[PDB]
Point group: C2
Chain length 71, copies 2
Amino acid sequence: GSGLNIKENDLPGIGKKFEIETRSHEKMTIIIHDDGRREIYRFNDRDPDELLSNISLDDSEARQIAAILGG
Amino acid sequence: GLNIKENDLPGIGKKFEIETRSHEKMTIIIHDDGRREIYRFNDRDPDELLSNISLDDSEARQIAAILGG
């Protein structure tokens, strides 16, 4: 329902996957690869089968975007 | 490479336009009241919005924690 929901899954030997549902009921998946790569996926609010957008960031880029996003 | 342009929106907040090394583009608006709005655009078409998301201050900080480790 409401509130922020974050589901974390280990991808053995690969990295970590975070599935996020926001208070606005929007959905995003973040994959953090062991090598540093971050992948963000944005899906249709009501259709998990439809990818709206995706972006790949290296570790340094993800950190800089994080700095902007957070505080 | 990575390019970031920061502008003030007077009386509203701040705007960051970001171009990545993968040549993907995003705009982040940070409102004074704490709202974050994120806009994703077509790499070659600035007038086509791919996706957008609204986060409160709490959410933005949590997601930032995940992204930046």
